[PDB]
Amino acid sequence: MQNTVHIDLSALNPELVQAVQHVVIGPSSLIVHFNEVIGRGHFGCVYHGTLLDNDGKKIHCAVKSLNRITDIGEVSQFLTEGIIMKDFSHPNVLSLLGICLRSEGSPLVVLPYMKHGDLRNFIRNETHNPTVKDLIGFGLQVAKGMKYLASKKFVHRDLAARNCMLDEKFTVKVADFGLARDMYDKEYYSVHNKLPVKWMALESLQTQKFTTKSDVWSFGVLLWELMTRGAPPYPDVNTFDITVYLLQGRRLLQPEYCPDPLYEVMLKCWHPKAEMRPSFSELVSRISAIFSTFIGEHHHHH
Template sequence: MRGQGRNCLLRRTTCSELQSGRGTGGKRRNSSMDRWYFGKLSRFETQNLLITSTNPEGAFLVRRSEKDDVGYVLSVKADDKAKHFQILQGGGGFYVVANRVFPDVAALVTHYRSNLLSTIQITEACVRMKPEPQDLSHITVENWERPKTEFTLGEMLGSGHFAEVYRGKWKDVANVAIKVLKKNDDLDHREFHLEAQILKKLRHKHLISLFAISTEAMPFYIITELMAKGNLQLFLRDPEGQNMDLLSLTDMAIQVSDGMAYLESESSIHRDLAARNVLVGEGNICKVADFGLARVIKEPFYVSDDKTIPYKWTAPEAISHGKFSHKSDVWSFGILLFEIFTYGGHPYPTYSNHQIFELITSGYRMPRPSKCSRPIYDIMQKCWGWSPEERPKFKELRSDLQSTRSYDE
């Protein structure tokens, strides 16, 4: 079955909460709580929900932290920022300030809607964003192949070795991205079909979603979801990206590692992981994209003699022997971390492609970026272990990145 329901990223309550109507303090959820209780959310997701023009000052939500030892958090929009208050449990109830204990979280919220929380007045529940569908319609769930007449091409968004990507429309209803094959030879057809086949099998909130294909006549189309803010490299170089704090950058890196951990679990490798191939959507949600070089592997290594590889992002064993694996993707992820924490900077900025292999063979690794913490740089260096066996798995990288975040009120 292709469809896996809607990507309800912004409200991830557990099944037991939804079924029992419980979720805060063991009390049954009521219509008021339905408005302000958002289930499990990260600090990053919460910030991007609250800091929108549709939410007034004092807009709030209650969430479960992704960190098990934190529990419930009351998050409030104050001075165009998100302020977070941990809700503690003890003394027979719930509290933010120890001398003011409430029987349940709903009572706590009711109190602080009429009384100051520190210096902040909470006002109304955060506006909920509509979840984005993972498919265009019930038609495309069952039938990938769609006629070109259903799609309209708009502006070009980018161009690669064998395809161009356009902003597009499906039936003048849904915004989509359309990848159009530029050339007409057997090799390009094969690469194009491989990309489509891999995308059909992959469904994850941090991987780009395939909507449809059109291959009845040239040029071939691959139709995917449209990410409003473009690729991560350009986003980080624009004013919005330049103003992101380090915690937000870390959360973007965690999102990419989460998508790659899923890819790893599906025995698939990307082979072209870089900031230019990560797309950014509303709420600064990041998704790994451009699966033109991706492969499903049954052996530890996939061997390729392709000489057009992006050297500055490629692991040494892939440069020298064409050996690609999950661990070569990990090396590339280390370069991606460098791009993120230099706000879209160029890796090895003073060196040419043909110098790269000699550099890394000699033991050279890029120095720590000026705005990058030591723990994050340590993770980069783990990714750049000389042998594949030295490098961590993406699941470990995701955990390591999460551990660098400290809970912030």
């Protein structure tokens, strides 16, 4: 059975195994509420969990597990989704609590619990009803998280509202790193070995090369999701037809209640020339200026 699966750590890249050991959680310190599914990632389901800290205090966490354990390659990619987050320390980026792996079964990627859940379902919720200014503020928070990520030379590749979480203080955190890659000193990441077609930059669709500038494009799509309150992008355009649609200069259209200065920012994110797109630092500056000059009702701290 799957519960008897044994992972041979000798088969993985030593640097990965060392990184996993550096964030190891002993099995006696973790309780997985396996009967309480809270979400899903690219590799499996997410469950409620309880961690016991160094002083025996209970910490509410989220636990990702690997749904399919048939090959080492998938095990490697799953552990990497946890490992890429190891040194993350920013208010708008989800931190890694650790990784638990015993003799049998799935490795377990442990994360802080995010009270309000995913950003997409949050903004779609008729109760929540966030104001226009609250939405711009969430967009600003995401830009701050991405400025941090790009500074560490990591490329997200999957920035979408679905992949962001809100904690008890309504702090938005970029949460899923299932496709994120270290750019090292290359300033790009090319496909070797899922891809979000409707959030991808035109050049990534064409060449399968990813950069911070293609993350800027995805960010623009995220802003559009925020301003439409979680509407699906290009609903009348097929995935396979997106490349041509974008080649023709067509873009996501201005959401009904979106301020004109914020739509202009979105259009800058979708410039056909990646070098012409603003950086994350510039996006933080521009959005902060729009947020501070849109005088409307707002409830959260951004």
